[PDB]
Design a protein around this ligand. Sequence first.
Ligand SMILES: C[C@H]1O[C@H](O[C@H]2[C@H](O)[C@@H](O)[C@@H](O[C@H]3[C@H](O)[C@@H](O)[C@@H](O)O[C@@H]3CO)O[C@@H]2CO)[C@H](O)[C@@H](O)[C@@H]1N[C@H]1C=C(CO)[C@@H](O)[C@H](O)[C@H]1O
Length: 476
Amino acid sequence: KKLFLVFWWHMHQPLYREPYTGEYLLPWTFFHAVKDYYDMPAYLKDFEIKLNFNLTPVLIDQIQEYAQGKAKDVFLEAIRKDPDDLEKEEVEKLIEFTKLNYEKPIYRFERIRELMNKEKLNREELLDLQTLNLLAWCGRTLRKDLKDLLNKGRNYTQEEKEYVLNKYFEIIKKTLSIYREIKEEGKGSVSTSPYYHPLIPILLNPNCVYETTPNVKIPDFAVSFREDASKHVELAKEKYFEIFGEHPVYMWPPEASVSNEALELYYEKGINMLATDEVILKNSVERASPYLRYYFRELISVFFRDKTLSDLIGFSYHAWNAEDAVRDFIGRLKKIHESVDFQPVVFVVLDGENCWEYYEENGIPFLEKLYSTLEKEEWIETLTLEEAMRKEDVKTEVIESVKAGTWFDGNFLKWIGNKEKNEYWKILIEAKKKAKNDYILVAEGSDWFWWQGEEKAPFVEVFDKLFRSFVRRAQE
Ligand SMILES: C[C@H]1O[C@H](O[C@H]2[C@H](O)[C@@H](O)[C@@H](O[C@H]3[C@H](O)[C@@H](O)[C@@H](O)O[C@@H]3CO)O[C@@H]2CO)[C@H](O)[C@@H](O)[C@@H]1N[C@H]1C=C(CO)[C@@H](O)[C@H](O)[C@H]1O
C-alpha cells in the first residue's frame, strides 16, 4: 500500500517588458531564472523522484528573450556597468533594490550590512554592492561551481562580476532544454496556464465573485471578456506546442481559480486534468477529501491540492531547520498513509520560485534532504501528472458543481472589490472597448490587480507603469 505524492511547481512572471521602449523594467524574470527556473527541474538529475512543473507562456517568452541576448534589463544594466559609469538614478535603484531584499537569508552577507551602513559608497564598495546582489540570487548548480567566489563575500572585481554574469546567462540558455529533457525522460510532466495568467472565471463571468463574497462591489463590466478567456487558453496551447512539440493536456489554472464555466472552457479546449485548492473543495462538497481523483461532471479530472502540506513548504519551513522540516513533512505523510486503507493521492502544489529566498541557503539543504529522503522511502511513490491522471489503484469521486474561487481564501478579493483594484478593472473595461491587438490580453494578467491598492507593495509604481503602458498599447 503506497502513498502517491505529486509535486507540481508553478512558475510564472508577468510581462516586465515595457512595450514602447522594449525595456524590462524589473529584473525578477532574470533573477528567478538564474536562481529557480533551471535549478528546480535540475534536482531531477541528482534524485530519483518525479517532479512536475507549470510554465506560463508569458514566462517562457521572457526566458527566451533573455536566452537569446535580446532582453534590455534596466536593473541588470546597473549591475553590469563599471561603477564609474553608473548614473545617479542607477546607484539609487541599486540601493533601493538592496534595501528591499536586505533581510532575506539569501542576502546574508556581512558585507551587505556594512555597505548599507555607509553614507557614500566608493567604486570598490559599489562593485561589492553590484556583485553581492548578483550572487545573492545564485542557484544550486552555480552555488557549487562558484562556491569560492560566494565565500569571498567582499572585494569583488569587475572581471569576477562579469564572470558570474556569463555563468548566469549559461544557466538561462539551458533552461528550456532541461524541461524538455525531464519530460522526455518521464521524470516529470510539464503543464502550462492560460497565456498571461488571467483570472479565467472572472473573464468568463464577473458575477462569479458573488458565489463567495456577496457584499463585494465590482465595476460595470460593459464589455465581454469571454472570447479573450478562450484566446488565453488557445494561445497557451500553441506556445506550449511550439516549445515541447505537443499540445498540453494538463493545465494549472492561475491562482487555482475555477468555476463551473471555467471548467467547461478547459474541457472544451481539450484539457484532461487540472488541479485547484482544497478550500474550493470544502466550499463545494460535504465530504471534502483531497486524496481522491475527482471527475467534474465526467468531463475533466480535478485534483485538489493538500493545502496544509503545500503551505508548510510555501510558508512555514523557511522558519525551520532543514532536518526538522523534512522530519515533520515525512511524519505528516506517514499519518496520511496510515489514515486510509486505500492509496491516497497527495498533491503538493505551490509557486515554484518564491519561497526559497526566505530559506537558509536558498532552500537547498531543505530540498536536498527532502528529495534524498523521498527517493529512498519505500512506501512513497512520487508520480508525474500523467501517472497521477492514469493511475488505476486510487479512489475517485464525481463532482457536479464547484463554488467559484481561488486558492486565496477561496474568493477573489485579492484582485477585485476595493476602489483601487476596481479602478484597474474599469481601465481595462474601457480599453477593451477600443482594443486593437493582443496587448489587451497582457493587461488581463492577474498580477496587475494583485499589486494595485495594497499597503506598500514594492515597486508598485513599476507594475502600474507596465499595466497602463500595456493598456495604452492595446488601443494602438
Ligand atoms: C513585487 C514582487 O515581484 C516578483 O514577484 C513575482 C513572482 O516572483 C512570480 O512568481 C509571480 O507571482 C505570482 C504567482 O505566480 C501566483 O501563483 C500567485 O502566487 O501570485 C503571484 C503574484 O501575482 O509574479 C510576481 C509579480 O507579480 C518578485 O519575484 C518578488 O520578489 C517581489 N516581491 C516583493 C514584494 C513584497 C510584498 O508583498 C515582499 O514580500 C517581497 O519580499 C519582495 O521581494
